[PDB]
mmCIF file of C-alpha atoms in Angstrom:
data_model
loop_
_atom_site.group_PDB
_atom_site.id
_atom_site.type_symbol
_atom_site.label_atom_id
_atom_site.label_comp_id
_atom_site.label_asym_id
_atom_site.label_seq_id
_atom_site.Cartn_x
_atom_site.Cartn_y
_atom_site.Cartn_z
ATOM 1 C CA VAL W 197 43.112 68.338 27.425
ATOM 2 C CA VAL W 198 42.787 70.707 24.259
ATOM 3 C CA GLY W 199 43.787 71.002 21.227
ATOM 4 C CA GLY W 200 45.680 67.587 21.136
ATOM 5 C CA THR W 201 44.909 63.795 19.898
ATOM 6 C CA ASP W 202 44.132 61.026 21.339
ATOM 7 C CA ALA W 203 47.474 58.904 22.462
ATOM 8 C CA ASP W 204 48.647 55.514 21.584
ATOM 9 C CA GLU W 205 49.084 52.221 23.722
ATOM 10 C CA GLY W 206 51.641 52.398 26.249
ATOM 11 C CA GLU W 207 52.710 55.915 24.793
ATOM 12 C CA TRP W 208 52.540 57.356 28.250
ATOM 13 C CA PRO W 209 53.118 54.236 30.367
ATOM 14 C CA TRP W 210 53.517 56.604 33.074
ATOM 15 C CA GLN W 211 49.907 58.350 32.881
ATOM 16 C CA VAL W 212 47.454 56.870 35.719
ATOM 17 C CA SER W 213 43.832 57.605 36.229
ATOM 18 C CA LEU W 214 42.376 58.377 39.615
ATOM 19 C CA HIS W 215 38.952 57.579 40.862
ATOM 20 C CA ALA W 216 37.248 57.904 44.109
ATOM 21 C CA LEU W 217 34.260 55.962 45.246
ATOM 22 C CA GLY W 218 30.911 57.327 43.738
ATOM 23 C CA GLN W 219 32.828 59.886 41.112
ATOM 24 C CA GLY W 220 34.558 57.852 38.970
ATOM 25 C CA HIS W 221 37.864 59.811 37.189
ATOM 26 C CA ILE W 222 38.915 62.706 39.196
ATOM 27 C CA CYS W 223 42.649 63.336 38.426
ATOM 28 C CA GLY W 224 45.163 61.957 36.789
ATOM 29 C CA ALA W 225 49.018 60.841 38.567
ATOM 30 C CA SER W 226 52.148 59.912 37.598
ATOM 31 C CA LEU W 227 54.339 56.610 38.182
ATOM 32 C CA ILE W 228 57.403 57.641 39.983
ATOM 33 C CA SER W 229 58.104 53.899 41.146
ATOM 34 C CA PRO W 230 56.688 50.328 42.156
ATOM 35 C CA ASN W 231 54.969 52.127 44.993
ATOM 36 C CA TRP W 232 54.095 55.963 44.416
ATOM 37 C CA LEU W 233 53.036 58.595 42.195
ATOM 38 C CA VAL W 234 52.838 62.081 41.612
ATOM 39 C CA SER W 235 49.548 63.987 41.371
ATOM 40 C CA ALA W 236 48.218 67.357 42.603
ATOM 41 C CA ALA W 237 47.269 68.511 45.560
ATOM 42 C CA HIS W 238 43.332 70.285 45.285
ATOM 43 C CA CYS W 239 42.647 66.922 44.499
ATOM 44 C CA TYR W 240 43.004 65.096 47.803
ATOM 45 C CA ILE W 241 41.296 68.062 49.926
ATOM 46 C CA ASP W 242 38.470 67.024 52.455
ATOM 47 C CA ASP W 243 35.509 69.129 50.781
ATOM 48 C CA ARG W 244 31.717 69.175 50.772
ATOM 49 C CA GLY W 245 31.424 66.118 52.890
ATOM 50 C CA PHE W 246 33.612 63.851 51.297
ATOM 51 C CA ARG W 247 37.569 62.758 52.108
ATOM 52 C CA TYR W 248 39.223 63.721 49.233
ATOM 53 C CA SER W 249 42.549 62.831 51.499
ATOM 54 C CA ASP W 250 41.533 59.199 52.902
ATOM 55 C CA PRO W 251 43.476 56.927 50.951
ATOM 56 C CA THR W 252 40.621 54.331 50.892
ATOM 57 C CA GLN W 253 38.192 56.374 48.341
ATOM 58 C CA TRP W 254 40.456 56.247 45.770
ATOM 59 C CA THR W 255 41.540 53.875 43.142
ATOM 60 C CA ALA W 256 44.230 53.814 40.884
ATOM 61 C CA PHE W 257 44.425 53.211 36.900
ATOM 62 C CA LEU W 258 47.819 52.035 35.176
ATOM 63 C CA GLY W 259 48.116 51.506 31.609
ATOM 64 C CA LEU W 260 44.438 53.199 31.315
ATOM 65 C CA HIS W 261 44.048 53.886 27.533
ATOM 66 C CA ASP W 262 40.193 53.840 27.246
ATOM 67 C CA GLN W 263 37.596 54.910 30.419
ATOM 68 C CA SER W 264 35.187 53.078 29.036
ATOM 69 C CA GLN W 265 36.793 49.644 28.765
ATOM 70 C CA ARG W 266 36.516 47.955 31.736
ATOM 71 C CA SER W 267 38.976 44.957 32.823
ATOM 72 C CA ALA W 268 41.840 45.699 30.419
ATOM 73 C CA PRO W 269 44.873 42.970 29.787
ATOM 74 C CA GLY W 270 46.967 45.930 30.051
ATOM 75 C CA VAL W 271 45.809 47.805 32.697
ATOM 76 C CA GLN W 272 46.510 47.322 36.328
ATOM 77 C CA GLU W 273 44.346 48.238 39.433
ATOM 78 C CA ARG W 274 45.321 49.060 42.635
ATOM 79 C CA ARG W 275 44.110 51.011 45.997
ATOM 80 C CA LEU W 276 45.728 53.560 47.852
ATOM 81 C CA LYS W 277 47.655 52.866 51.280
ATOM 82 C CA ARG W 278 48.478 56.490 52.029
ATOM 83 C CA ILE W 279 48.104 60.509 50.526
ATOM 84 C CA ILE W 280 51.138 62.958 51.878
ATOM 85 C CA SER W 281 49.933 66.635 50.258
ATOM 86 C CA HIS W 282 52.530 69.010 50.593
ATOM 87 C CA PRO W 283 52.764 70.245 54.414
ATOM 88 C CA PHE W 284 52.589 74.105 52.601
ATOM 89 C CA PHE W 285 49.735 73.406 49.869
ATOM 90 C CA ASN W 286 47.253 76.238 49.884
ATOM 91 C CA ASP W 287 43.439 75.839 49.135
ATOM 92 C CA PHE W 288 43.365 79.012 47.624
ATOM 93 C CA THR W 289 46.321 80.904 46.291
ATOM 94 C CA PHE W 290 47.666 77.208 44.995
ATOM 95 C CA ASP W 291 51.194 76.853 46.515
ATOM 96 C CA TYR W 292 52.789 73.436 46.464
ATOM 97 C CA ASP W 293 50.150 71.888 44.624
ATOM 98 C CA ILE W 294 51.559 68.749 44.956
ATOM 99 C CA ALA W 295 51.114 65.129 46.833
ATOM 100 C CA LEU W 296 52.556 62.128 46.631
ATOM 101 C CA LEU W 297 50.152 58.870 46.823
ATOM 102 C CA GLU W 298 51.416 55.383 47.653
ATOM 103 C CA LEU W 299 50.252 52.121 46.140
ATOM 104 C CA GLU W 300 49.497 49.271 48.755
ATOM 105 C CA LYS W 301 50.584 46.541 46.313
ATOM 106 C CA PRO W 302 53.253 47.542 43.766
ATOM 107 C CA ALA W 303 52.933 48.211 40.507
ATOM 108 C CA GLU W 304 54.262 45.593 38.293
ATOM 109 C CA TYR W 305 56.411 47.131 34.612
ATOM 110 C CA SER W 306 55.649 46.439 31.542
ATOM 111 C CA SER W 307 55.303 47.555 28.193
ATOM 112 C CA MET W 308 52.020 49.482 29.217
ATOM 113 C CA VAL W 309 52.802 50.489 32.958
ATOM 114 C CA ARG W 310 56.253 52.157 32.803
ATOM 115 C CA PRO W 311 57.948 54.621 35.560
ATOM 116 C CA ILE W 312 58.551 58.396 34.426
ATOM 117 C CA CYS W 313 62.170 60.146 35.245
ATOM 118 C CA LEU W 314 62.707 62.510 37.691
ATOM 119 C CA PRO W 315 64.290 65.687 37.114
ATOM 120 C CA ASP W 316 67.448 66.113 39.526
ATOM 121 C CA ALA W 317 66.794 68.785 41.841
ATOM 122 C CA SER W 318 68.624 71.133 39.471
ATOM 123 C CA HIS W 319 67.307 70.170 35.656
ATOM 124 C CA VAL W 320 66.074 72.789 33.688
ATOM 125 C CA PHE W 321 63.013 73.234 31.333
ATOM 126 C CA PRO W 322 64.771 76.340 29.660
ATOM 127 C CA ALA W 323 61.944 78.442 27.798
ATOM 128 C CA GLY W 324 60.425 77.784 24.012
ATOM 129 C CA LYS W 325 60.877 74.206 24.767
ATOM 130 C CA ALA W 326 58.193 71.886 23.872
ATOM 131 C CA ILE W 327 56.791 69.244 26.398
ATOM 132 C CA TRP W 328 53.678 67.033 26.402
ATOM 133 C CA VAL W 329 50.653 66.831 28.363
ATOM 134 C CA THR W 330 48.216 63.894 29.004
ATOM 135 C CA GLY W 331 44.944 63.208 30.803
ATOM 136 C CA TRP W 332 41.104 62.239 30.212
ATOM 137 C CA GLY W 333 40.391 66.122 31.292
ATOM 138 C CA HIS W 334 37.502 67.960 29.450
ATOM 139 C CA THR W 335 38.064 68.250 25.767
ATOM 140 C CA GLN W 336 37.587 71.925 25.546
ATOM 141 C CA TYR W 337 36.444 74.053 28.636
ATOM 142 C CA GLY W 338 32.964 73.787 29.659
ATOM 143 C CA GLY W 339 32.901 70.349 28.045
ATOM 144 C CA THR W 340 32.824 66.266 29.070
ATOM 145 C CA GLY W 341 35.724 64.329 29.747
ATOM 146 C CA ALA W 342 37.308 61.994 26.863
ATOM 147 C CA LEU W 343 37.345 58.024 27.207
ATOM 148 C CA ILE W 344 40.706 57.894 25.252
ATOM 149 C CA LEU W 345 43.949 59.235 27.174
ATOM 150 C CA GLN W 346 44.318 62.352 24.933
ATOM 151 C CA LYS W 347 47.735 63.986 24.208
ATOM 152 C CA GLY W 348 48.664 67.373 23.880
ATOM 153 C CA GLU W 349 51.996 69.699 22.971
ATOM 154 C CA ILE W 350 52.822 72.427 24.525
ATOM 155 C CA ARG W 351 56.175 74.289 25.611
ATOM 156 C CA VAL W 352 57.897 75.965 28.557
ATOM 157 C CA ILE W 353 57.192 79.727 29.175
ATOM 158 C CA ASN W 354 59.066 82.885 30.301
ATOM 159 C CA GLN W 355 58.500 82.983 34.212
ATOM 160 C CA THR W 356 58.027 86.819 34.075
ATOM 161 C CA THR W 357 55.574 86.470 31.113
ATOM 162 C CA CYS W 358 54.025 84.046 33.546
ATOM 163 C CA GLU W 359 54.073 86.212 36.322
ATOM 164 C CA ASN W 360 52.734 88.951 33.997
ATOM 165 C CA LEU W 361 49.492 87.072 32.091
ATOM 166 C CA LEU W 362 48.168 86.150 35.330
ATOM 167 C CA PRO W 363 49.234 89.307 37.521
ATOM 168 C CA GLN W 364 49.693 88.856 41.734
ATOM 169 C CA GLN W 365 49.278 84.979 41.442
ATOM 170 C CA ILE W 366 52.814 82.855 40.150
ATOM 171 C CA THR W 367 54.816 81.705 42.417
ATOM 172 C CA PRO W 368 58.374 79.986 42.098
ATOM 173 C CA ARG W 369 56.588 76.653 42.590
ATOM 174 C CA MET W 370 55.085 77.121 39.870
ATOM 175 C CA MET W 371 55.630 77.304 35.617
ATOM 176 C CA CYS W 372 53.361 78.447 32.580
ATOM 177 C CA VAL W 373 53.589 76.121 30.120
ATOM 178 C CA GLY W 374 51.244 76.160 26.907
ATOM 179 C CA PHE W 375 50.781 78.880 24.135
ATOM 180 C CA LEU W 376 50.122 82.263 24.309
ATOM 181 C CA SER W 377 47.697 81.989 21.533
ATOM 182 C CA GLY W 378 46.226 78.686 23.129
ATOM 183 C CA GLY W 379 44.447 76.187 21.462
ATOM 184 C CA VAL W 380 45.825 73.696 22.850
ATOM 185 C CA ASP W 381 46.047 73.200 27.272
ATOM 186 C CA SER W 382 45.024 70.904 29.944
ATOM 187 C CA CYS W 383 41.498 71.513 31.658
ATOM 188 C CA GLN W 384 39.761 69.929 33.821
ATOM 189 C CA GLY W 385 39.820 66.017 34.618
ATOM 190 C CA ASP W 386 43.529 66.538 33.703
ATOM 191 C CA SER W 387 45.095 67.721 37.347
ATOM 192 C CA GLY W 388 47.635 65.806 39.035
ATOM 193 C CA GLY W 389 49.016 64.456 35.418
ATOM 194 C CA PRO W 390 52.847 64.955 34.662
ATOM 195 C CA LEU W 391 53.992 67.003 32.007
ATOM 196 C CA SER W 392 56.092 64.775 29.950
ATOM 197 C CA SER W 393 59.380 66.055 28.247
ATOM 198 C CA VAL W 394 61.384 64.045 26.087
ATOM 199 C CA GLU W 395 65.299 64.894 27.003
ATOM 200 C CA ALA W 396 68.301 65.051 25.190
ATOM 201 C CA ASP W 397 69.451 61.341 26.312
ATOM 202 C CA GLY W 398 66.130 60.092 24.741
ATOM 203 C CA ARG W 399 64.111 59.281 27.967
ATOM 204 C CA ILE W 400 61.149 61.827 28.931
ATOM 205 C CA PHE W 401 61.465 63.492 32.114
ATOM 206 C CA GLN W 402 58.615 64.694 34.537
ATOM 207 C CA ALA W 403 58.980 68.900 33.982
ATOM 208 C CA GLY W 404 55.153 69.839 36.480
ATOM 209 C CA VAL W 405 52.104 68.585 37.558
ATOM 210 C CA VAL W 406 48.808 70.133 35.864
ATOM 211 C CA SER W 407 47.626 72.393 38.505
ATOM 212 C CA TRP W 408 44.987 74.849 37.671
ATOM 213 C CA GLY W 409 44.882 77.996 35.047
ATOM 214 C CA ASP W 410 42.278 80.467 33.997
ATOM 215 C CA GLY W 411 39.933 78.861 31.768
ATOM 216 C CA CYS W 412 41.651 76.494 28.729
ATOM 217 C CA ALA W 413 43.434 76.773 25.510
ATOM 218 C CA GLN W 414 42.736 80.595 26.335
ATOM 219 C CA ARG W 415 44.791 83.332 24.336
ATOM 220 C CA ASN W 416 47.299 85.209 26.877
ATOM 221 C CA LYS W 417 46.237 82.259 29.651
ATOM 222 C CA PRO W 418 48.638 79.149 29.256
ATOM 223 C CA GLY W 419 47.904 76.555 31.825
ATOM 224 C CA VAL W 420 49.833 76.371 35.632
ATOM 225 C CA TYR W 421 51.461 73.442 36.475
ATOM 226 C CA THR W 422 53.725 72.753 39.564
ATOM 227 C CA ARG W 423 57.590 72.894 38.889
ATOM 228 C CA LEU W 424 58.749 68.930 39.539
ATOM 229 C CA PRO W 425 62.457 70.184 40.384
ATOM 230 C CA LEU W 426 61.582 71.963 43.595
ATOM 231 C CA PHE W 427 60.058 68.801 45.072
ATOM 232 C CA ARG W 428 62.979 66.252 44.019
ATOM 233 C CA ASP W 429 64.567 66.170 47.650
ATOM 234 C CA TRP W 430 60.861 66.110 49.079
ATOM 235 C CA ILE W 431 60.061 63.120 47.017
ATOM 236 C CA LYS W 432 63.505 61.354 48.489
ATOM 237 C CA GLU W 433 62.733 62.900 51.807
ATOM 238 C CA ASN W 434 59.230 61.166 51.826
ATOM 239 C CA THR W 435 58.416 58.620 49.394
ATOM 240 C CA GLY W 436 62.207 57.244 49.475
ATOM 241 C CA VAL W 437 62.525 57.393 45.492
ATOM 242 C CA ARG O 298 16.288 80.919 49.964
ATOM 243 C CA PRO O 299 20.143 81.284 50.112
ATOM 244 C CA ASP O 300 21.109 84.141 47.710
ATOM 245 C CA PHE O 301 24.156 81.855 46.600
ATOM 246 C CA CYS O 302 21.616 79.306 45.430
ATOM 247 C CA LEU O 303 20.637 81.403 42.609
ATOM 248 C CA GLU O 304 24.257 82.062 41.445
ATOM 249 C CA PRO O 305 25.392 80.436 38.373
ATOM 250 C CA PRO O 306 27.464 76.808 38.925
ATOM 251 C CA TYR O 307 31.389 78.095 39.941
ATOM 252 C CA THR O 308 33.854 75.524 38.126
ATOM 253 C CA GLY O 309 36.775 77.339 39.319
ATOM 254 C CA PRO O 310 40.752 77.465 38.050
ATOM 255 C CA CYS O 311 42.009 73.747 39.429
ATOM 256 C CA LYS O 312 41.186 71.295 36.955
ATOM 257 C CA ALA O 313 39.465 68.060 38.921
ATOM 258 C CA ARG O 314 36.849 66.443 37.495
ATOM 259 C CA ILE O 315 34.111 66.794 40.744
ATOM 260 C CA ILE O 316 30.835 66.099 39.539
ATOM 261 C CA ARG O 317 28.664 68.404 41.639
ATOM 262 C CA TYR O 318 25.334 69.735 42.182
ATOM 263 C CA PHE O 319 23.806 72.755 42.145
ATOM 264 C CA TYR O 320 20.143 74.442 42.648
ATOM 265 C CA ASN O 321 19.074 75.766 39.256
ATOM 266 C CA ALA O 322 16.860 79.106 40.212
ATOM 267 C CA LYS O 323 14.382 79.322 37.592
ATOM 268 C CA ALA O 324 14.351 75.451 37.344
ATOM 269 C CA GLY O 325 13.129 74.521 40.735
ATOM 270 C CA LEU O 326 15.569 71.653 40.174
ATOM 271 C CA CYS O 327 19.201 71.276 41.463
ATOM 272 C CA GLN O 328 21.454 69.719 38.615
ATOM 273 C CA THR O 329 25.277 68.421 37.734
ATOM 274 C CA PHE O 330 28.530 70.494 36.581
ATOM 275 C CA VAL O 331 31.617 70.299 37.242
ATOM 276 C CA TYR O 332 33.823 71.392 39.952
ATOM 277 C CA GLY O 333 37.493 72.391 39.042
ATOM 278 C CA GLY O 334 38.429 71.207 42.921
ATOM 279 C CA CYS O 335 39.161 74.813 44.320
ATOM 280 C CA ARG O 336 37.602 78.336 45.149
ATOM 281 C CA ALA O 337 34.085 76.339 45.635
ATOM 282 C CA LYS O 338 30.920 78.407 45.965
ATOM 283 C CA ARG O 339 27.997 77.872 47.967
ATOM 284 C CA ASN O 340 25.659 76.682 45.582
ATOM 285 C CA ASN O 341 27.971 72.912 45.493
ATOM 286 C CA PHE O 342 26.939 70.270 47.067
ATOM 287 C CA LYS O 343 27.760 66.827 46.799
ATOM 288 C CA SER O 344 24.903 64.997 46.504
ATOM 289 C CA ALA O 345 21.098 66.094 45.027
ATOM 290 C CA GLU O 346 19.451 65.590 48.792
ATOM 291 C CA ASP O 347 22.443 68.182 50.195
ATOM 292 C CA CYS O 348 21.326 70.725 47.335
ATOM 293 C CA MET O 349 17.350 70.291 47.497
ATOM 294 C CA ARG O 350 17.965 70.793 51.179
ATOM 295 C CA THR O 351 18.934 73.978 51.403
ATOM 296 C CA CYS O 352 17.752 75.851 48.240
ATOM 297 C CA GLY O 353 14.789 73.691 47.548
#
């Protein structure tokens, strides 16, 4: 991400690094239980002769902190049994950009690998509410990724403001998070990563999936993510979680 | 020859980090760039091979 700083060992135990055969890190995901993740959709769309949807081509990294660090005490490694892109995702308008990734062998909770909490159907994240974005995405539009899971703080925005900042593009399943003056925002490589929100009760809840946005950290161009409530029941209905 | 071969490497609005190859016109060699994961353009392949076989 852009405008943020380095996170700490386990500061975001639910973050995950997803890699694809011959390509290294591609996207991020969110651990929502011992056997499931919550990533983007575009991340797994067969293109240019590569089965980005085929689970046999993916490896997930739980508790990852440093991308260049090989074999780590607190990092789990797992293959994927299957991917479930939403039945109404749109590779062009970006609608329903959300997918579920099932781990083969379970994750084993620990200090550095814990599951984030899912907002219940009706939860609300009022505009103006600060939340966090994490990932190994590019650190400035048009640059390179980061070795260390960066963290950045942005905030929810009024929906119409969103809709109008990105004319004839926003859909109910989407939500602008960031700042109008930019400076901080998610970027390439952060996709599928979870927006972490500290709730009044003390626990963090996923409030969105990194999806897209015009540029990165641009003024009047806040990041666009997938609302997490509308799909709670879809999750329940598929994963079973 | 393909005119799309001479257009600049388009990343896209999405935020995936897929290294892809594109033909560098005024450089005769295909190179690397990052594809956001959506709205790909014709001058974006998977391997240097694929790239150099259609834009050579």
